[PDB]
Amino acid sequence: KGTDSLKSSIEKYLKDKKAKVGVAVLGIEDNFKLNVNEKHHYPMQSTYKFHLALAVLDKLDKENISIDKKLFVKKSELLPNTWSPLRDKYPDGNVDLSISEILKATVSRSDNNGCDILFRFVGGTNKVHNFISKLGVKNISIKATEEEMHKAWNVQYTNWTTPDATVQLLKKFYKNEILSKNSYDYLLNTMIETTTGPKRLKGLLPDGTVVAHKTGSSDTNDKGITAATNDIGIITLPNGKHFAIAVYVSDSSEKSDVNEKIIAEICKSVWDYLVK
Ligand SMILES: [Cl-]
């Protein structure tokens, strides 16, 4: 009963789903906690852009560098054949772009080139990994850039996480325990402003529900396996309180609409329990 009933209900929902689904929920201002299939390592995909953002903002805070500081981005950096609004906008590259514009593209629109530019700025994947670990959150592995991930099929598996780790990280962020007030406000806004993943965490929630989130997606291999279909974030309840949730649908044989629906239904079931 109570939380246990919710977990069981979610478990029942997942029994006929041909995927490995991981779930974690953490209440922001209360003691609520939920975990389903927590132990497993789930591939992050674009969800890791959130962590990267924390690292860049943290670097800016420490070095007292403005978010308006411009970085010259070489043409070679704006790789083709990858999702990049930045490349589309600046096809010839060789342009000076503010960190703010780069961050916005990376977090709000999942820009791959933007993510790699930022990884360079903070010093590489290991630096981000260290930064996250040093925050007291274990079980998150960050080893590959977007460029690297676009090669072999199994590179994406090297960027992994447990669901609970994500939720712990989100809560710390949401409570403004990691960055400065200015940086926190900015990142949060970018997370709310996004139009990605409308059928995921947000899909069955009521119109007007504020959700700050970051999506993650993958390709489908020739055996019909979609490696990752993810959505992570902070949701605002009707009473004004919040909860962090992370859902990873991994190694799925299901159709793309089903994978999104799984995230949506699971979130909806959590929401209903929490509202009550
Ligand atoms: Cl923060």
Automatic annotation (TrEMBL):
It is an enzyme of class 3 (hydrolase). Keywords: Antibiotic resistance, Hydrolase, Plasmid, Signal. Residues 23-249 form the Beta-lactamase class A catalytic domain. Gene3D superfamilies: DD-peptidase/beta-lactamase superfamily (3.40.710.10). It catalyses: a beta-lactam + H2O = a substituted beta-amino acid. GO terms for molecular function: beta-lactamase activity. Its EC number is 3.5.2.6. PROSITE patterns: BETA_LACTAMASE_A. One of its GO terms (biological process) is beta-lactam antibiotic catabolic process. Belongs to the class-A beta-lactamase family. This is Beta-lactamase.
